[PDB]
């Protein structure tokens, strides 16, 4: 039953006031993209910075197993858009926040689905 929950160990390491995981590969883009959290190509906007998924993944970076029966990674081979105001800790940001299934934006940093984009059909 023993499991080495890294996320909780990293949140505590940051709460203790520790320098976050650096060397996150930041990409060069126009900054005029959709704005979605995770994409197959840099989609940053005037308020975001795009990075390489694998370089922002705690599991990939720490050479540990991904929380999933098959052990599949959702950042590797993708590009994660991070708010310019949180770009100092891209890895920690992808853990403390979750993406939206409706618009794909970060909940709290782009998503506005809980304000009626459409009238739920009728």
């Amino acid at each position: 039953a023993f499991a080495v929950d890294a996320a909780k160990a990293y949140k505590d390491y940051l709460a203790s006031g520790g320098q976050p995981i650096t060397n996150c590969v930041k990409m060069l883009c126009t900054h005029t993209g959709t704005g979605q959290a995770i994409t197959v190509t840099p989609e940053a906007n005037m308020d975001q910075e795009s990075f390489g998924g694998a370089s922002c993944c705690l599991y990939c970076r720490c050479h540990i197993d991904h929380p999933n029966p098959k052990g599949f990674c959702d950042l590797k081979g993708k590009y994660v858009q991070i708010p310019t105001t949180c770009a100092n800790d891209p890895v920690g940001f992808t853990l403390k926040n979750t993406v939206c299934t409706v618009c794909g934006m970060w909940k709290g940093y782009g998503c506005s689905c809980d304000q009626l984009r459409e009238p739920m059909l009728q």
């Binding site: 370089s55 081979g77 590009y79």
Partner: protein, 297 residues
């Protein structure tokens, strides 16, 4: 000068036609570093300018394009270069990278170990090498042709590069190989490219464009490497990154280049013509199978 708004500078044709002797590479701005956009890594800027330049070439870009990238690892444990290639290459392109040391990558598949142990039964559409042996810094004798990983690449280009395929091998003043320059003569065109972000280094990417499998011209490695140092010594390049501030047309267009398996004898002058324009890629279209040898002892 005016070549500051370009991603880099290519070795002029009149410099390749010379027959100079090898000499110490004395760059005028050696050590000077370039000003990069806030928070951008050096190898992200470098691979960006390299890709920006490749866009101007007659590269063959088919559907489900195959690209292998040797020396993709770094002493930071990440693949900035692979991240750029992943961005630049059309969505659905098969990208495989490899390094001597372990690292995290956005590649569809990563192999860890000496490129010597890397084996594959498939031909590739594009080969990118950024491999450099640190032991090269120990300059104790003449600057002679290096072997090591260059031996492998020269063989991998002949056995695993698809006709119409292109390459981009990174070299320096002391990190170079005679047989590598001789192979550039087996392509429809070639050149020594120098990124502006690293124009203060003797580094350059030898670029073969549209492999033909047969020599078009008789190049001499030692002489051609002497022509390069001479060009670099007599032509100081100013450090620039102005090409990095415009990513509007960076992605490689999916030219949908044709892919045919034409044996070894149906290669007439009408096909060599099609290979020399990136309109054709000659190789098998089976499933990609790669592997790394494990030395047990």
């Amino acid at each position: 000068s005016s070549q500051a708004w370009q991603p880099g500078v290519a070795m002029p044709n009149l410099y390749k036609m010379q027959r100079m002797l090898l000499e110490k590479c004395d760059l005028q701005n050696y050590g000077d570093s370039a000003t990069l956009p806030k928070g951008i890594m050096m190898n992200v800027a470098k691979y960006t300018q390299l890709c920006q330049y490749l866009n101007t070439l007659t590269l063959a870009v088919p559907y489900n394009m195959r690209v292998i990238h040797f020396g993709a690892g770094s002493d930071k444990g990440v693949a900035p270069g692979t991240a750029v290639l992943r961005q630049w290459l059309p969505t659905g392109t098969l990208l495989v990278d490899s390094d001597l040391n372990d690292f995290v990558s956005d590649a569809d598949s990563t192999l860890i170990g000496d490129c010597a142990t890397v084996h594959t039964a498939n031909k590739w559409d594009l080969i990118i090498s950024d491999m450099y042996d640190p032991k090269t810094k120990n300059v104790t004798k003449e600057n002679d042709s290096k072997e090591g990983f260059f031996t492998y690449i020269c063989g991998f280009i002949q056995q695993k590069l698809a006709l119409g395929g292109s390459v981009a091998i990174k070299i320096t003043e002391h990190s170079w190989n005679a047989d590598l320059y001789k192979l550039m003569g087996h392509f429809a065109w070639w050149t020594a490219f120098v990124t502006n972000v690293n124009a203060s280094s003797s580094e350059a990417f030898l670029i073969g464009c549209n492999y033909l499998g047969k020599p078009r011209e008789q190049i001499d490695g030692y002489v051609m490497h002497a022509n390069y140092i001479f060009w670099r010594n007599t032509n100081p390049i100013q450090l620039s990154s102005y090409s990095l501030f415009d990513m509007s047309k960076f992605p490689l267009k999916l030219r949908g280049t044709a892919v045919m398996s034409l044996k070894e004898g149906q290669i007439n002058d009408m096909i060599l013509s099609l290979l020399s324009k990136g309109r054709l890629i000659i190789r098998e279209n089976n499933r990609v199978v790669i592997s790394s040898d494990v030395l047990v002892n």
